[PDB]
Structures are given as structure tokens and as C-alpha cells.
Scaffold this active site. Structure first.
Site, PDB file in Angstrom:
ATOM      1  N   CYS A   1       7.984 -11.935   2.351  1.00 24.33           N
ATOM      2  CA  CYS A   1       6.714 -11.897   2.911  1.00 24.33           C
ATOM      3  C   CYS A   1       6.510 -11.164   4.072  1.00 24.33           C
ATOM      4  CB  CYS A   1       6.184 -13.188   3.218  1.00 24.33           C
ATOM      5  SG  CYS A   1       5.769 -14.233   1.786  1.00 24.33           S
TER       6      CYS A   1
ATOM      7  N   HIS B   1      -2.324 -12.804  -1.354  1.00 24.75           N
ATOM      8  CA  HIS B   1      -1.002 -12.616  -0.848  1.00 24.75           C
ATOM      9  C   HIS B   1      -0.295 -11.818  -1.707  1.00 24.75           C
ATOM     10  CE1 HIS B   1       2.358 -13.050   1.871  1.00 24.75           C
ATOM     11  NE2 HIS B   1       2.816 -13.888   0.846  1.00 24.75           N
TER      12      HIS B   1
ATOM     13  N   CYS C   1       4.786 -15.609   8.116  1.00 24.87           N
ATOM     14  CA  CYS C   1       5.974 -16.259   7.911  1.00 24.87           C
ATOM     15  C   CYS C   1       6.840 -15.873   6.831  1.00 24.87           C
ATOM     16  CB  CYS C   1       5.602 -17.851   7.651  1.00 24.87           C
ATOM     17  SG  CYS C   1       4.513 -17.973   6.206  1.00 24.87           S
TER      18      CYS C   1
ATOM     19  N   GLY D   1       9.562 -16.697   3.626  1.00 28.66           N
ATOM     20  CA  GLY D   1      10.665 -17.010   2.620  1.00 28.66           C
ATOM     21  C   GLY D   1      12.078 -16.890   3.082  1.00 28.66           C
TER      22      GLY D   1
END
Lengths: 392, 392, 392, 392
Positions: D89, D348, D378, D380
Site C-alpha cells: 500500500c 484504494h 499504512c 500490509g
């Protein structure tokens, strides 16, 4: 009038191991080799065949009606007909009965009947029409799903073998001692060429050389009691049924040419027997292995025979649990059953199996001079099937 | 005596469109409903059924022996038997012949026979056991591969129907006139209520509500000639067969209840008809659509009938090319052929179709007072099948 | 003060054959063993690692960010970070340049960089979200499509090699001689133990026994000229490029631990080398094998070095044709180039390959006391990457 | 000399809904349009670009190095270079930091950096080389497996969000209000035209016509509290995290053109901002949504800024749970955060996301005259990334 149909001639391919000799051989090619074998064995031309009937449980990806594909390859002309059928593990014997009825009802003179299976060539599949917007989908093994899985209780055929084992209280030792006997009997017949008569060589065509398979490759040589007793249960984790005491996954085909007893006499053919009677009956799918018991009893009742008039029996060995059970109930002499061993050793090419044991039965009946015989098999989903044969 | 086998009752579901009403309905669920419906209209309990024979071409992934699954779900007990068969497109009408032969040979008293097919649920597949070391492969559509692709030359049935067109000198206007005449005949009869009696409603169990399918949805209302003459040929870029004058891809099931004529009289059942005779014959695969010709000549000859004798026909419309070629050769009055319509309009669930057109013939013969009657079909790979019917 | 970055330690796995030793080993397990090795060889603890950067071209199906999986498995703390990158064949070297840059810009102290690849575990795929209405579709080999096929021209990397063969007039004899020589030089280095220092053994965990892999399995022993001469062109049927004068499909990982020169001095580490310069440049996709030419020239210009200043060179052997072209144009002494053999012999685990040849450079530079080295690779899609190393 | 890098210009596509506007658009097509856009916006010719760098998590089946595909489509010369990267991400922002570093170490003058993603086009896969000897196997959704599943604990990103909800004691009502607020703020901003400056329209080429997409299609208009409150938890049958208070599955691309501050001044460019600092830090994978805390703190420390110095903030909303924990811990005025809505509303598109929110930050900073900004995501696997931007 009373029809009187005969098995004029017969032939099976060798039974191949899972992903072995015939790992890439379509069933109908095997079907084609057995079809031409029984035609030449009886001295009947392919152009005299009216119809071809072949059991087959796993035909996915093979194209239209493989029964027609095997007939046309084998040199049966286009003016004939052909179809496949599925009574699962009983299919290959059932087809022989369905061919017997075509002649009995006046709709055919000469049928070729049996089964064929390639468990090796069975594909994985998934229903992909809707489309998969998100998420894993299973690619389903048609061999496991369509051949080995009870549709009603969701578990493998070997779980039904656990059920029958616990019903009859058949110990792990008894099941293993039946498994090793079958491998010793079968290895013994193979060495002595007692399988040569029925087997027709199949040639596996290749890029880098042709290969001639003429030998059952699934038979374990020097099968020992300790080798059986070393194994883990495959289905129930505290159970009795192992890979050693159940049959395997296999490839092969097998057939019988059928004609009326008078037509055989016209042409100078010496049939491998008269089909005196046959029968199929259903039991509970949970204990499908008990199938052969009502089935073998009805067949005998139709022949007007008692169990103690028989001379030879082929009772198919799906599992040493169910094979042992059938034998206990019917009480026939175990020394006349699976004389050349059974499926635990030879293999279990599902749709072909019934014609497979029929081939084995007819040739040993000719070899030893038995007059009265019987072939029977247990059937997934809870059936049995059976056939009474008398030597001319 | 003579084996005189009657059809006590008959019932079919409606035929669905491809990925339509029965899109995610297993074929055996559709066959379960017809087994109950045949048993209900006769007044015969499920327990009295000996065996269930269902033709089915596309069983991949549906589990062990869907014929058995169909019978158990319908309440036919575990003691009975069941099995599938496959002579492609004649399968549903040949299962009725097979069940007849059970009764004629005295191995069964009561048979439920027909066909079932879920072409929407047929999956894609590939053989993956050896693995695929490198390079792209195909996931194969088993509906096309095993249901519609001639195994011998590699092409669609819509190219075998093109071979019948070039041979029998049929035009793009002759076929467009036959397809609208079978859509107008079928829309007429549908709004009339002539399909009401044969159809037994099927319940499609949803999650946000059930749906009751009680009408064939492949029939298109208000068929013009502009829509039929505006399409582009599907199987030859300069050809004559299209989506509109060829049959569809469909779901559906159908079945008859069989017993001896004596047994109907005991149970106070007024039979739809008596099965006088039947037959199948082979033809060149290239031109499979001419199966109905020699098959109906064989069936008629066996009944001791002329073509003139017939009061009603059901000649299955797999295509407009094969259909017109069969109508012209045999020379029967086309005013009596496909009287409530054919499979261009109604649809073509492969394994069911043979049992589907038997229903239409049997319920129209009852209604219009036609004494004699023949249903016929063409079969992929190069065969034909036919069965003569007489009224009581 | 200009940032000086050094390679403190390095390691690689053996390079496995396609579906060979590492046939079922995820790239990240290989990367984890090399991360643990560079840390042990430098005397640095996992706890001190700021970031792991692993080039990897084929991660499909391996899960989220395999570089993080490798770092975590190796016991690098959750507080560190990790990412993957893709400049095709250039990846494993580019990653080291990228690692160098993290320290040059003051954003990290300690980086493990390299690449990893399991060409064996690369899956087949298809886009199935829209949903396939009807017919067959393709399962795509991700290794071929995403690794080996030019995205602009649609042909294999080997076809780009043919373009280079034609442009530089490189005979089949010259290419085959080069290939044989790469095998013979690799075989010799292997036998003499020249790969031991660079290789860290990899334990392939087994159900029925663990296997330690510490030898390059793709190197052909006793490679003959005739063995290359006999081969068919693999890409152009009248071409010169073959399976034998191309590199193979392989598995492996390779890495380097980096830090500043002053940091290595505080720790007392004797580093393998100082990164003096690097460069990357594009060329025509059609002749991507020529990438090393502008990339090496630009890297040397950045170091302040003449081509003749180099004591040792690793120029990666994607294909004999392109290796030959590169050597011709640069004109460096061929006896200082791939002295221990190259990728024709050793293998080409795409994303690892640049770190693989850097390992070989570094450990031979140390062993022979070569002061000035260069590592360079061609890159699919038309690019080059080069790195200059000097001994401390 | 302390290198000072500016963002000369930036652009993004609209964000497409899952299988919506960009349903069959390859990611590199989207990237090509944004590359062209940053060039046109900045007054820089494609020929001047040294390198293109694009984050992308789900490139499977798109072919060799999609970053190079995009660059070449956009007319960037073969002599430039391009590569993709994957820090999940964080990718699309990390690529910008990495672009800055190319210029900072003197390796390049002009870089195009961002990210691209088509979650719609991501395929299903399986490893099929070793073959599947027997039993079912999964076709894996690469989006879920490689994009959205934690590789260590085997659960969805949504479960990590539940972990953060539990740990910070964040009620369902608080999460739902946050979600509703993201929607309504994004709606208002879209309606007022505030996304127009950042968005470059994207032409979806058709067959029956081209469609221009220049509006973010995932934003729900008139989102109600009740519409969030009625949803069932999506990951824990007794949880708080839902479809509604999580971001979605989306497609898009976004980019920035970078060069030195001194270079912008020569060219007469008024830059969107100067990159003052960046940071990436790891956290427990189980609570990955907390990544922004240590990353933002680290980036501010590096810039020499207090939290209170910031005038605008984009903190990516992966899930309402983690967005809320992030805002609580940092304590920045929530009124300066995601002022035009966030990814719960906007979508997203994994690899593009970080460059997506960089675009929104830059164009709002310009709009309101805000001097100091920060973007953070943030990641993964347990990471955070953040960048500090100061207005010129």
C-alpha cells in the site's frame, strides 16, 4: 422360444498403474484395441457388428461419445451405432447384459460390450460460466468427485469400506491377510502366463519409440504380510483400511463379442460361455460393499442355481473389508474365488472393471474346465451387479 | 403373449435457456422432479420402481452417477437401481427403449426412463496430472468438447448441418421459413395451453425467494422473417446455418413410466400409448442429421407400418438443414410434423431431448385422437434413433 | 566528504535447474537463507538491519511482498522494512544500487540487497472476473508472459538475441564455441571449489528427508561442441540461437550487505568492495542484449575509469549472441570476463541474476586480488545496468 | 549542497470502482496517461525523462515490466529506463521518495514517479508445473493472496483492522461516523470541483464508442449513517469492521514529475512543492494500520518539524479503525486531515494509492495556500511510509 446368447470371444488390455503405462492414453484407444481383438478372436468382421456398448464413468474432455470413437477407430463402419453407460463400478459387466438384451429382443445380431477407463486422463474441472468476481475457486478432480465420492454422504468409497468392516467386525489383520493373498495369487498367475490368453497387447505410440504393454503393472511382486501391516489407514485415522488392503486407481479396457448360440454355430465359433442370467440390486450407499450379496443371490435365483453348484467365482475386490464380507455371507468356497487374484493386486479401472473380471473368469473357466461361474461387483452409491455363465 | 410394453405416464420440466432459469440447477435435481411426476400421474408409488435409466451427456463434476442421485432425491428407495447412458442427442429416447427391453426380458416390472441435461452447469476442464512444464494451455469447455464437437473431424454440429444443406440444395430462405414456422407453431401452442399437460412445474430454490418455472423460456414470441434473415452464419462465414435456424443450448429433464400392458390394466392406468417398436441406425458422421431417415424406416418396417399410416410425427429440429432433409426424403405430410413446434423454438437439452419429444407426441396423440405416432431424432457422430407408438 | 558505500558481505544459493532442486521452494525461503548468510559472514545481527530490498520478477501467488516474508523469516525485526522491485534481468543488481542510495542519502545505515527468483514456482493464470460466457480460454504461463516475452513485439527474448546475431554477423559456430567455453570454465571453477566461498548451502525440507543443496546444478559436465552443434534453432527455424547457446530457466537467491565505509571500519569488517559507480541506460527493445554496452560505458565514465583499467568482469550471458556482441563492442580482454563461467552454464534466475553475478565478481576479485571489477546485464524491454566495484 | 528536490507537477486518473469504469484497462494504460499528463503540466517533453518509477503490487499477466510499457506508450524514449516496485500500500508514495533519491545522488535529472494498479484485471492463478497427481486444488485470486492477505497470519487486512479497533477500543459507531464523514467530505469536494485540478481524464477506448472518465466513481453520494450501521461485520462475525467503514478494491494511477529545485527555476517552473523529508518504519503485522504513527513521527523529526507545524495532512484511510487510531495517537487537528475526503470514499488502488493521496495533498496545498504538508499510509505486512512537503 428362448433366445440363448453367448460370449463368443473376449479381450482386455493390461491394467495400468495410476499415471503409468497408459498415463496419456485416452480410454477409447484402449477400447479400440479390445474391440478389434474380440472381432479377430471370434473371426467376425467389424462390418458385421451392429452396435458397441462401453461402460465408462469418467469421459470428461474426451469428446463426443467415446464409445463411438473406439468403434470407429477399431474399424467398425459408420452404419453401426455405439454408446456409453455408467453404473459406476458395475458398468463394464452391465454393458454386457445390455448387449445381451439387444439380441434377446430381436434388435441386434452381433454386439461388442464391456468397459473402458482412463483414471489417468481424467481432468480437473470448475463451473466457470457465471464468472468469478472475487475469490479462490476449486479446480475439482473428476476422478475423485465423479468416481470415488459418495454423493449422499460426502466421503470416499473407502469410508464405506470402514462401515462394512465395523459391521462385520473384520480386523485389520484379516483385511491385510486377504490383501497379501490376492497379491501372491496374482503374482503367481502372472508368472505362469494365466493372463496371456485374455490380454491383448496395447501399443503406446510415442515420439521416441513405441512400447508394448502386455503385463499388469499394478501387481506387487513379493507382497509380504509385514509390508501390509506397516501401512497407515488412508480414510479413518484410527481405522483398518489402508492403501495396501484396498484396490488402486488404474487404466484399462475389456470386452466381449456377443451373438446368439445358433449364429456362433453357423460360423464355427467356440464361445467362452452362455449368459444364463444376470441381476442388479440396490443397498444402502453407506455400505455399498454389500452390493454383491443380494445381486449374486438374485442372479443365481434367475438361473435356477444353488450357490453350491458353482465351479468358479470372480467377486471384485474394491476393498479387503467388503470382499471378505461378501465371501462370509454367501459362503462360497474361497478357493474358487479370485483364483488368479483380484483387484487389490490387478487394479480397478472403474468402468472397465466388470468386463475385466469377466475376461479373467471366462479364460480360467476354459483353462481348468469349469462349467458354472459367476462375476459380481460392489457399486458406489449402493448397488450390486451379477452374471451366471455356463460353458458350452 | 408378446412383450407389449406401454407408457403408463409421462412428464417433463420446462426447458430452460442457457444460463437462464436452471442456470445453477444440477441436472439430477431436474430429473428428481420428473421421476416423482411420472409416479404421481400414474398413481404408482416410488417404492415399486425397479430401476431409473437416465440419458445424460454432460455429468462432469456432478458426482457419482447422477441418475442414482436423481432417483434417491425423488424418493425411489435405496433398493432400486439407476444408471446413466449416452448416445448423445438420442439419449433420452433410447433410455425409453432400454427400459422397455428390461420389461420385455423380464428382469424388471416397472421402469422410469428418460433424459436429463444441465448444459449451463457443464464445467471447463483440463488434464493436469502430468502437469504443464512450460507454455500456455487451454481450459476446455466440456459442453462444446463433449456435447457439440464431432470427435472425428474436429468441428461443430453446425458444420454437419451445413454439409446437409450443400448436399440437399437448401437455401438461406428455405431454412429461415422453417425456423419461423417452428417458432410460430410453438408460440401458438404455448399460449393455447397444449404444453400445460406434459410440463410438471420445477421449483428453483433461491435464497432471496423461490421461483416456479412452468414454461419453456427458449420460445421467442412474435418471430418475424427480418430477424431470421438478418443474422450472420455462425459456422461458415459465407454459409446458411445461423443461431436462428439452429437449435439452442438448454437445460431440462423428461421421463416416461413403463410397465407391461397387462400391468397397466391391473392398476387401472389408461396408458398414453403402447411401444410397438423402435430402432437406431448409423450414418456418415459428416452429415449426422440424416440419422432420422434410416432409423424411422427401420422402426416403421418393424411395426409393419407404412409412412402413410402415421397420424402424428415428432422429428427433432437440431437444425433447419437436417430437419428439411428428413421431411423431404421420407415424404410424410409436414402438416402433422412438429405440430406444437420443435427444438429450434423449444430448445435442445442434449440428453433430455429424446425424452422431451416423446412427451410432446404422447400428450398430443391423446388430445387430437391420433392412433399411430412416431418420434425421431438425429445423433452426433453419425446415428439416428426412432420409436413407433400406438394409442389405446 | 562524499558518501562511500561498501559491500561488507555477500552470499548466494546454488542456482537450481528448472523444476530441479528447488522445484517446490518459494523464492522467499531462498532469500531468507541468503539474508542470514550475509549477516553471519559480516558479523552483523539481524537486529541491526534497517531494510531488505529484493529484486523479483515472478512473485505471483507467493503472497504479500515476498521481500518482507524473506526478512521476517531471517529474523530481521518487524521495525525494519522491506520491498520488492522489478527491472527484469537487471533487478538483482539494481537493488544493490538502490540499497547504496538509501545509505548515501542518510536514510538508512544497514541494508541487505539483492534478488530472488523461483521460476519453477511461477504459476499459470487467467483473468476470470468478467466471466467466460462460452468456449475455451487460455491459462497463461506467468514465467513466459511476465518474464521472457517482449511486451512491444510479442516475441521471446531469444528472438531479440537473433536480432543481435544478425546485426553483429555472429555465426552459429561462434555462439556454440562461446557456449561450450562457458560450460567448461564453470565446470572447472566448480571442481576446483571456486563457488564454495560465494555459495551458502540451502536445506530443502522434506517429508522423507532433508536435502542440502550446495552445488550449481545446471552446469553440464563434459559439455561437447558436438552437443551444441546438433541442436535445432529454438526461435527462428533457420536461426542460430538454440537452447544450448541461450541460458536456462532457473531458481536462486543472491544478496549483499551494505553499509558505509566508515561504518565497516568501526566494526572492523574487511569489506568485499567499495561501490564506486553504477549506471542504467535504455536501448531498442528489439536488441535488448546490447544494454551492457551503454550501461558499462556510462558506469566507467562515472568511476573515472578506462575500459582497460578493469582487472575483472562479469558480463551476464543471457545468450551467446548478445554476450559476444557486448564483448566485441567494449573490446575488453575476454580472458578477464566470466572467468568462472557464466549464465549459459550456471543459470539465469531472472530477478536474482544480477546479485548472482555480483557474488561471483566479488569472491573472484578477493581470491585473485583484482582491484577493479565491473558487473553488467542486459535487460528485457531494452535496458542495461552496470556497477563498478573497487577492492579496499 | 544538500540536494533539494521538487515536485514540478503531478497528476492522477480518477479512481475506478472494482470491475467498473476501468474493468478491462491494463494498469500501464492508466500509467501512460498520467506520465503524459505530468509532462504536459510541467512543460517537460517526454524526451527529457531519465527514468520512470511505478509502484504496482498486482502486475501478473500484464507482461514484462509494465512500468516500461507505460513509459514507452507515453513516448518516453527507449534510451530512458523504467522499473516497478512493491512496498504494498506504500508503493506509490515510496516510488516518489526513490525518484527523489535518483536526483539527490546525481544519477538522474528528471524522474517520473508514482504508481499504478488494476485490481480488476488481476488474475486467478495456480502452480501447475509439477502437476496435480490427485485431489482438488485452488485457483488463487492474486488480488487477495498477493494484495490483501497477511502472509504471516494468513488473514485479511480487515482482521488487522479489527486488531486495531480492539486495541484502541474504537466502537462501531465511531468507525461508522468516520466513514460517513469521509463520503460526505469527498462528495462535497467532487461537487465543488476540487478534484478537477489533480485528475487527468482517461479515455476508455471501446468498440461501440470511447468513454472519457474524469470523475472518481467509487464516491457514494448521499451516504447515510443508517447505510453504514446496517452492514454486518465483514471479517469477524462479532466485529466492528465492515465493507462500509473499509476502503474498496479499485483501479487507477497517479504520478509526480521530479527534478532539482535549481532545475525548476532554470525552466521557470512554479513547483507544487519541495520534498523536505520522508521516512518508512516497521510495526507488528498484526496491527499494520498503525504504520503511519512511527513513519510520520520519523518524517517530521527529519524535516525538523513539530506535528503542530503542519497545515495539511493526507493520512490514507485503509480502514476507519486504523485511520482513527492514527489520528488519536498523532493528535493532529482532524480538521486539516483528508479535508476532501479519503479512500473510504475515493477508493484504494493499492500500488497507486500513495501517489493518489500525494496528488490530493499537493493540489489542496496550492488551493488554500498551505505551506507545510504530510502524506502517510499504512502498509500490509506491518509498515508505514510518510513524506513531508513544503510549498514554494
Amino acid at each position: 422360444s428362448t433366445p440363448s446368447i453367448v460370449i463368443a470371444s473376449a479381450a482386455r488390455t493390461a491394467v495400468g498403474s495410476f499415471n503409468g503405462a497408459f498415463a496419456n492414453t485416452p480410454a477409447h484407444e484402449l477400447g479400440a484395441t479390445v474391440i478389434s481383438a474380440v472381432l479377430e478372436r471370434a473371426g467376425v468382421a467389424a462390418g458385421e457388428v451392429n452396435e458397441v456398448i462401453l461402460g465408462q464413468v469418467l469421459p470428461a474432455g474426451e469428446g463426443q461419445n467415446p464409445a463411438r470413437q473406439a468403434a470407429m477407430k477399431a474399424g467398425v463402419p459408420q452404419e453401426a451405432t455405439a454408446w456409453g453407460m455408467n453404473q459406476l463400478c458395475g458398468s463394464g459387466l452391465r454393458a454386457v447384459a445390455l448387449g445381451m438384451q439387444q439380441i434377446a429382443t430381436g434388435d441386434a445380431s452381433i454386439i461388442v460390450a464391456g468397459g473402458m477407463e482412463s483414471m489417468s486422463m481424467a481432468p480437473h474441472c470448475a463451473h466457470l460460466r457465471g464468472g468469478v468476481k472475487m475469490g479462490d475457486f476449486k479446480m475439482i478432480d473428476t476422478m475423485i468427485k465423479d468416481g470415488l465420492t459418495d454423493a449422499f454422504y460426502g466421503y470416499h468409497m473407502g469410508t464405506t469400506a470402514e462401515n462394512v468392516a465395523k459391521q462385520w467386525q473384520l480386523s485389520r489383520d484379516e483385511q491385510d491377510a486377504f490383501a497379501v493373498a490376492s497379491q501372491n495369487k496374482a503374482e503367481a498367475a502372472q508368472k505362469d502366463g494365466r493372463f496371456k490368453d485374455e490380454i491383448v497387447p496395447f501399443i503406446v505410440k510415442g515420439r521416441k519409440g513405441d512400447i508394448t504393454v502386455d503385463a499388469d503393472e499394478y501387481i506387487r511382486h513379493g507382497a509380504t504380510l509385514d509390508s501390509m501391516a506397516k501401512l497407515r489407514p488412508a480414510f479413518d485415522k484410527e481405522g483398518t483400511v489402508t492403501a495396501g488392503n484396498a484396490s488402486g486407481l488404474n487404466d484399462g479396457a475389456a470386452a466381449a463379442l456377443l451373438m446368439s448360440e445358433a449364429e456362433a454355430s453357423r460360423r464355427g465359433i467356440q464361445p467362452l460361455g452362455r449368459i444364463v442370467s444376470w441381476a442388479t440390486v440396490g443397498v444402502d450407499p453407506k455400505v455399498m460393499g454389500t452390493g454383491p450379496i443380494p445381486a449374486s443371490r438374485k442372479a443365481l435365483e434367475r438361473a435356477g442355481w444353488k450357490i453350491g453348484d458353482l465351479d468358479l467365482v470372480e467377486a471384485n475386490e474394491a476393498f479387503a473389508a467388503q470382499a471378505c464380507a461378501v465371501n462370509k455371507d454367501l459362503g462360497w468356497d474361497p478357493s474358487i474365488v479370485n483364483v488368479n487374484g483380484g483387484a487389490i493386486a490387478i487394479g480397478h479401472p472403474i468402468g472397465a472393471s466388470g468386463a475385466r473380471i469377466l475376461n479373467t473368469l471366462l479364460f480360467e473357466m476354459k483353462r481348468r474346465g469349469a462349467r458354472k461361474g459367476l462375476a459380481t461387483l460392489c457399486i458406489g452409491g449402493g448397488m450390486g451387479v451379477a452374471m451366471c455363465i455356463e460353458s458350452l
